Write an enzyme that holds these catalytic residues in place. Sequence first.
Site, PDB file in Angstrom:
ATOM      1  N   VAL A 458     -30.958 -53.445  64.229  1.00 60.03           N
ATOM      2  CA  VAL A 458     -29.195 -54.631  65.035  1.00 60.03           C
ATOM      3  C   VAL A 458     -28.715 -54.460  63.472  1.00 60.03           C
ATOM      4  O   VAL A 458     -29.256 -54.916  62.643  1.00 60.03           O
ATOM      5  CB  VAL A 458     -30.248 -55.763  65.264  1.00 60.03           C
ATOM      6  CG1 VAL A 458     -29.680 -56.433  66.464  1.00 60.03           C
ATOM      7  CG2 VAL A 458     -30.879 -55.991  65.924  1.00 60.03           C
ATOM      8  N   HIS A 459     -27.344 -54.150  64.570  1.00 64.66           N
ATOM      9  CA  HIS A 459     -26.729 -53.729  62.794  1.00 64.66           C
ATOM     10  C   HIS A 459     -25.465 -54.236  64.045  1.00 64.66           C
ATOM     11  O   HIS A 459     -24.700 -53.657  64.835  1.00 64.66           O
ATOM     12  CB  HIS A 459     -26.131 -52.048  62.555  1.00 64.66           C
ATOM     13  CG  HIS A 459     -25.424 -52.013  61.891  1.00 64.66           C
ATOM     14  ND1 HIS A 459     -26.180 -52.222  60.567  1.00 64.66           N
ATOM     15  CD2 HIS A 459     -24.056 -51.560  62.276  1.00 64.66           C
ATOM     16  CE1 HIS A 459     -24.098 -51.810  60.065  1.00 64.66           C
ATOM     17  NE2 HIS A 459     -23.713 -51.189  60.892  1.00 64.66           N
ATOM     18  N   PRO A 460     -24.405 -55.308  62.426  1.00 69.53           N
ATOM     19  CA  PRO A 460     -25.066 -55.494  61.382  1.00 69.53           C
ATOM     20  C   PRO A 460     -25.618 -56.826  61.394  1.00 69.53           C
ATOM     21  O   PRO A 460     -25.118 -57.562  61.977  1.00 69.53           O
ATOM     22  CB  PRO A 460     -23.475 -55.434  60.550  1.00 69.53           C
ATOM     23  CG  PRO A 460     -22.724 -55.225  61.468  1.00 69.53           C
ATOM     24  CD  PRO A 460     -23.179 -55.420  63.115  1.00 69.53           C
TER      25      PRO A 460
END
EC number: 1.8.1.12
Lengths: 483, 486
Positions: A458-460
């Site tokens: 999962v970014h950021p």
Amino acid sequence: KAFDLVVIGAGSGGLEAGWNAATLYGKRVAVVDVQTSHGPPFYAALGGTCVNVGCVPKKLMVTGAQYMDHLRESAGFGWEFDGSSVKANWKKLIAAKNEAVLDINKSYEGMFNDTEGLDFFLGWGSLESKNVVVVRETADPKSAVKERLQADHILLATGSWPQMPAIPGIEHCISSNEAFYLPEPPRRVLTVGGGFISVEFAGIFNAYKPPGGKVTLCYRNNLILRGFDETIREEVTKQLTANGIEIMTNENPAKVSLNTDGSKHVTFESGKTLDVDVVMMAIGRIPRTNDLQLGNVGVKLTPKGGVQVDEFSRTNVPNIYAIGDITDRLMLTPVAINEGAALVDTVFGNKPRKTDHTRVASAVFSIPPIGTCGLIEEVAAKEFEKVAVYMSSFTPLMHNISGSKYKKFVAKIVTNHSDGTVLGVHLLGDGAPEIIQAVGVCLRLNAKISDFYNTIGVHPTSAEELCSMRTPSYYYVKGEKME
Amino acid sequence: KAFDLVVIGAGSGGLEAGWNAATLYGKRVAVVDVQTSHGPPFYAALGGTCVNVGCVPKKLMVTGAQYMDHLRESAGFGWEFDGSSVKANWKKLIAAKNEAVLDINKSYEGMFNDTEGLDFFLGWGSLESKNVVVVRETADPKSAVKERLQADHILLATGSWPQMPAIPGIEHCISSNEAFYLPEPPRRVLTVGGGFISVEFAGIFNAYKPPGGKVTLCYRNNLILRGFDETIREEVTKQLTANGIEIMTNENPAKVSLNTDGSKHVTFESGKTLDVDVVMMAIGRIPRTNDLQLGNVGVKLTPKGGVQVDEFSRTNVPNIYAIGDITDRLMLTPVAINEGAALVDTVFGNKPRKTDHTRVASAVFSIPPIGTCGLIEEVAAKEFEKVAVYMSSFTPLMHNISGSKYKKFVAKIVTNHSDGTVLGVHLLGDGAPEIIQAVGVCLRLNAKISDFYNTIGVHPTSAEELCSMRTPSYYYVKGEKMEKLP
Ligand SMILES: Cc1cc2nc3c(=O)[nH]c(=O)nc-3n(C[C@H](O)[C@H](O)[C@H](O)COP(=O)(O)OP(=O)(O)OC[C@H]3O[C@@H](n4cnc5c(N)ncnc54)[C@H](O)[C@@H]3O)c2cc1C
Ligand SMILES: Cc1cc2nc3c(=O)[nH]c(=O)nc-3n(C[C@H](O)[C@H](O)[C@H](O)COP(=O)(O)OP(=O)(O)OC[C@H]3O[C@@H](n4cnc5c(N)ncnc54)[C@H](O)[C@@H]3O)c2cc1C
Ligand SMILES: CC(=O)N1CCN(CCCc2ccccc2)CC1
Ligand SMILES: CC(=O)N1CCN(CCCc2ccccc2)CC1
Ligand SMILES: [Br-]
Ligand SMILES: [Mg+2]
Ligand SMILES: [Mg+2]
């Protein structure tokens, strides 16, 4: 009065046990505690140590302390305001905390009033005989008898109590218990201890200290937070220091005297001196067995003063059990709760269950915080031929902008390198306690490093570091570290 | 001029494939992009959309926006200051974000310089033939050829681009691209769209608006954030509303005109009008396939315009692959990266591996944010005979003290009730994006609800709610919602 179960201590573990036995197994349940709401004189009360003078209020106060960083850090993101108008009103924090705690006290009071077959008794519980709990006016066993409770089964769930070193001027020092009720924020405070309570309170006092104030933490050993990942120990030391806390390692108070103005004059074993308004002792917590008169039934204690138990929380006496801090296994609320539930399932459900004290996710609400689950590398290295450490450490980008460039995030995964099984995950940085929870579920499922790095990030986030490490940073082979 | 691998687009997917091929399999790699650092004229650059005009700057700007709430919320914890002195300096935020992005641009430039057989070419990549990429000076196929690259293998990784509805006065509107470079924070702004970009930008503009400001979000249908958990969609709607954002649902701009003062007069399909300083369109992103001249080699596109690929990111044309937003599936950086890593571990590592597009953890940096992994109950309910929904929703104690009582935390676990297997996890609240990451690992491991409930909580956290839920709140039985099983 006759009960299937009598619980001494209406805390995390005692309330899980009593509620479960009454509601899930239809048992008639008595629960005893010394106070119906938080604070002096006995501090813990209905709800337990966590509710009254532990996890719940401390988390609220650390949340408060975090705004010192947020106010400063806001400027990097373009926030402007009158810095000289800024005051940390400790009185408002304590009042807000007191209301939150009292509301919990009240809700537990209502829980007992509204739950049939679950009865609360106020006063001091002790063992008269192996099927009789006596509730008295005070901790003194010669005080007036309020109740005598016939009990098929007795659960000891009285928790722990702060340890105070027998040093001269101990009477001029407080524990965490009193720290929750200080009417004014100390200008100068010494926290004594390198554990989570000392570190967490050092952060609270550091944020709320009046102008020209100073927080000092002292610890006898060389590096704070023994039991935690060593890189995290070193970084939390640096990050406390960077936020203005004085870390005195290899130092211990020898004695305390009053200066003439009533401040505390501290002499360390090194002969260093420190004048402070408060000395908060956070050097350990000891099981509360003194008041239980366990001599009346011959329940086996450790020299420490804990109740010895098998893995099912059974004492040497049939029908008498102990859970939570009184057992000195892992002093965490969710563990006390898990022990209480497992005990009641085993005894009243004939659903035999023991608490797993391994791979327990926990946190330190330092600023910034720690989240950890499972073994540190030094421990894994003694138990496994080949250990790999995957490490990612850096200043998050938001903290290059915020101006807190000292706030190094640390993510470390420790594996059994023979099969890739994750043994330990250790996090330092914003969100660490929130990240580590579902890591607990991973370690229960025997996750391997490949399960982490094949999961899509999962970014950021800070968390995605856990899913971006392909290659070990170093190893231990037969207990020896190899780059 | 001869390369093992030529990559068009130095973005999330393109750089992962490029780097890995070079450093892991000592391959010789050309990467093409139109720009070496962020911003106009082409916005995306070396590092790609996420780095330049996406996740990275967006997250810094949401973090900035969050201080509006922290400054207010601090009062509940005893923090006192002159609230009348509080100013949000948007110009400061944008300069800090620009410097942050440029440093990443330069950090990638370093990567290319310091890496044998990894070379960056500047200009526009298109396909001449099955094995030749031409780099031109512009997007015009008629501009000057700067380079002719021979390619044993060609990776298309040109990403996506905002869609602008062809309405009268669309030229008065911006996309997220321009939003990153506004010289001043709009007093009044209309974010058009119900997706994460419109929602995130409504939050950002809401925190940095000058006095007498107003953020309006419009969406053509009834409820924002299609594809997210319904409870969360309704809750985000309330929480955005509680923080002063106006949500116009069942509304869509029909046209925009400039007022004489340079402001925008928006006319809606409904006949409603609104004056705003900025109209930001965030109605969708479309794959960037135009400029690759794909008709020259017969690479097949989809009924939607994305490069058609198999599970191995292979096009219909041998030697030619496509990853990331150009494939028009899940438009997420870590998915593009996973596809690039798999494609290279496959074709050059001789270790075939395919991206799993199920059970992908993702987030919306709404205030407060969403963290989600796997199926929403409506979708589960159509695939599985019996679905359980476990739900815990409350205002966390800190937000009773903070004064943001409206910040209801939502934790939902969706299971296959036949065996307890977790199908999806849906979180709304502070720290949801951080909580959800290790949930993605749990779902990869086929975690059951009993694996969550038998794990000991970390206390106090929001995350421990996930380990406290033993009893379904309700079920779907053969597609039908009900409190209790038959
Ligand atoms: C400052 C501090 C911070 C903490 N923070 C955290 C944290 O963040 N997370 C975490 O998981 N854990 C934390 N802990 C630990 C946690 O509070 C304990 O592990 C937990 O409360 C233990 O539960 P228990 O059931 O053993 O006993 P307790 O919850 O302590 O309950 C024991 C109860 O017994 C009562 N009692 C004692 N003697 C008698 C008697 N003779 N008769 C009647 N009643 C009696 C007491 O009044 C008390 O209410 C913290 C502890 C402290 C001190
Ligand atoms: C506002 C916004 C916010 C987002 N936030 C998030 C988030 O928080 N989390 C998340 O995971 N995702 C987020 N995304 C999505 C994310 O940016 C993309 O999924 C990701 O960047 C796609 O990677 P890619 O490899 O497909 O292409 P990109 O990273 O888009 O790279 C494509 C590159 O190709 C270049 N290019 C295009 N055509 C040519 C050509 N003909 N020749 C040469 N070069 C060319 C472009 O210059 C660009 O640099 C966000 C997107 C936007 C717009
Ligand atoms: C500031 C810093 O040094 N770091 C934070 C970011 N970390 C992210 C690693 C995964 C990833 C995510 C998105 C694009 C590429 C890779 C890597 C370490
Ligand atoms: C309404 C609310 O504020 N909630 C947060 C706490 N949730 C329970 C979390 C687990 C737990 C920890 C410690 C004692 C018991 C249980 C329940 C929902
Ligand atoms: Br040490
Ligand atoms: Mg009752
Ligand atoms: Mg190079």
